[PDB]
From a paper:
In mammals, bicarbonate regulates the concentration of the prototypical second messenger 3′,5′cyclic adenosine monophosphate (cAMP) via the stimulation of soluble adenylate cyclases (EC 4.6.1.1). cAMP is solely produced by adenylate or adenylyl cyclases (AC), and its intracellular levels are tightly regulated. Mammalian cells express two different types of adenylate cyclases: the well-known transmembrane ACs (tmAC) and the more recently discovered soluble adenylate cyclase ([name]). Soluble AC ([name]) is found in the cytosol, is structurally and biochemically distinct from the tmAC enzyme family, and is synergistically regulated by calcium and bicarbonate ions. Here, we describe the first crystal structures of a mammalian [name], and the application of fragment-based drug discovery methods to identify small-molecule inhibitors of the human enzyme.
The next round of synthesis focused on molecules capable of forming a hydrogen bond with the side chain of Arg 176; this was an attractive design idea because the side chain was easily accessible and sits at the mouth of the ATP pocket. A number of heterocycles were then synthesized that could retain this hydrogen bond whilst improving the π-stacking with Phe 336. This culminated in the discovery of the novel lead compound 8 (IC50=0.36 μm). The designed molecule induces a movement of the side chain of Asp 99 to form an additional long hydrogen bond with the benzimidazole of compound 8. The molecule also forms a hydrogen bond with the flexible side chain of Arg 176, although the geometry is not ideal. The inhibitors were discovered by fragment-based drug discovery and occupy both the newly identified allosteric bicarbonate site of the protein as well as the ATP pocket.
Author numbering: 1 to 468
């Protein structure tokens, strides 16, 4: 008998799993909302803003209307190399944003020490990818890396058709603090990462006015062999591709059709992405430079450090947010959480969802979300930034691990406005002028100097319809 090889491995369920971490793909938890779980791990935060700041120049007429296509091509070329490093060193890419990716090595407490060594070596090899790299003069094709370790909480929230997850807690807070202290080419360890690490492996230096540390060198002991050490570490890595599947980047590439599993996983993925997965939309339709309105919603909690309290509050806010967005075909693109604010990146005018009066509707939707979430138990402060303009939209990442992402100055501006003007709804000049709403519905704001924004233009508070 003949023995033809190569199984089919391009099923819809596999294409869906590319959009999700192993944390979700192999998660098998209750469909109850909110769901919370607790574990330990090492977190890696890779700041990729250095090369995603490329977006505004790809709007230049020099790119002859192929700006979005060239942008996603060069972005994915560089991001795929980072992704391959994380995956081969045994990490799980949790999420992509325009400015960062976050990765997790989930492990039992006893193994934190050795796993930190694996993650430091991975971090240094990521920097190694960009050591002699540039385009057109500027060599800002480099990264900054923050590492944390310790207790991690997971939250899954959503309704009967959509799901979202977050990792939260002190190690999550720590990894963002570590990454913010980093300069180009740095690897920063959180204080707890440094307290838990194998100090014989590494040479550090102090960070001024900080308990966090910078890695100068990984200088192993004399008889150390990283390959044999890594093999020992794989004992604790549940989904590391092995044996017959050692040639694959992800075990998720071996997923077989399972309708109950697929029903669960598709809830995390936008319908237009599912349409492409199902071969009912051209594979390149979602890569575009597109005018959108960003509505960036930040929620700050009474007790920041209480996972048990914030879970129901995010769920209650989500239930209201999703009902208000449905009304104008607004979408939640991402949910993020670090400085204990939970942030919803909402988008109006995505592909096939663009409708007249985007601007008025985005403002009314922001006000509605603001009023409801302010009355939600345990939510201390709601802040909403609204910015409109040309943003890049596209699937960002590696073939085996990628996400639909929005990138652009107006994304960064809405994110900065909600942090710099807390407790209010703010909008940019485009939204204000284009709403055509009466001038007295707004308040002209003092100009603030905001991180990573230069010519922000006049900013406004959306006061609303009444003096009250
Ligand atoms: N927690 C989380 N659980 O899963 N993913 C989380 C997360 O936070 C994350 C993941 C990947 C990238 C990322 O980018 C940094 C960022 N955080 C932002 C907050 C507000 C505005 C803009 C922001 N950019 C964040």
């Amino acid at each position: 008998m003949n023995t033809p090889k190569e199984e089919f491995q391009d099923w819809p369920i596999v294409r869906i799993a590319a959009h999700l971490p192993d944390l979700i793909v192999y998660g098998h938890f209750s469909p109850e909302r909110p769901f919370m779980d607790y574990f330990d791990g090492v977190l890696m935060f890779v700041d990729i803003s250095g090369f995603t700041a490329m977006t505004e120049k790809f709007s230049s007429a020099m790119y002859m209307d192929r700006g979005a296509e060239q942008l996603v091509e060069i972005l994915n070329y560089h991001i795929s190399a980072i992704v391959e490093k994380v995956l081969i060193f045994g990490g799980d890419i949790l999420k992509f944003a325009g400015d960062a990716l976050l990765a997790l090595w989930r492990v039992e407490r006893k193994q934190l020490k050795n796993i930190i060594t694996v993650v430091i070596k991975c971090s240094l090899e990521i920097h190694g990818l960009f050591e002699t790299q540039e385009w057109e003069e500027g060599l800002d094709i480099r990264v900054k890396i923050g590492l944390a370790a310790g207790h991690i909480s997971m939250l899954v929230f959503g309704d009967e058709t959509h799901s979202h997850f977050l990792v939260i807690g002190q190690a999550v807070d720590d990894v963002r603090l570590a990454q913010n202290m980093a300069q180009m080419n740095d690897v920063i360890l959180s204080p707890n990462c440094w307290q838990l690490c194998d100090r014989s492996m590494i040479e550090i230096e102090s960070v001024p006015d900080q308990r966090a540390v910078k890695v100068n060198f990984l200088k192993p002991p004399p008889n150390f062999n990283f390959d044999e050490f890594f093999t020992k570490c794989t004992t604790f890595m549940h989904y590391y591709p092995s044996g017959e599947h050692k040639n694959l980047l992800r075990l998720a590439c071996t997923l077989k059709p399972d309708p109950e599993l697929e029903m669960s996983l598709q809830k995390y993925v936008m319908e237009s992405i599912l349409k492409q997965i199902d071969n009912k939309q051209l594979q390149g339709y979602l890569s575009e430079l597109r005018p959108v309105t960003i509505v960036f919603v930040n929620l700050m909690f009474e007790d920041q450090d209480k996972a048990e309290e914030i879970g129901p509050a995010i769920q209650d806010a989500y239930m209201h947010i999703t009902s208000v967005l449905k009304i104008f075909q607004g979408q939640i693109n991402k949910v993020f959480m670090f400085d204990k604010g939970c942030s919803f990146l909402c988008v109006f005018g995505f592909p096939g969802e663009k409708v007249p009066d985007e601007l008025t509707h985005a403002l009314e939707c922001a006000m509605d979300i603001f009023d409801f979430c302010s009355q939600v138990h345990k939510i201390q402060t709601v802040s909403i930034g609204v910015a409109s303009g040309i943003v890049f939209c596209g699937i960002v990442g590696h073939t085996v691990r990628h996400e639909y992402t929005v990138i652009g100055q107006k994304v960064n501006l809405a994110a900065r406005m909600m942090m710099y003007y807390p407790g209010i709804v703010t909008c940019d000049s485009v939204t204000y002028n284009g709403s055509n709403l009466p001038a007295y519905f707004f308040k002209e704001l003092p100009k603030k100097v905001m991180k990573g924004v230069a010519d922000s233009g006049p900013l406004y508070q959306y006061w609303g319809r009444t003096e009250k």
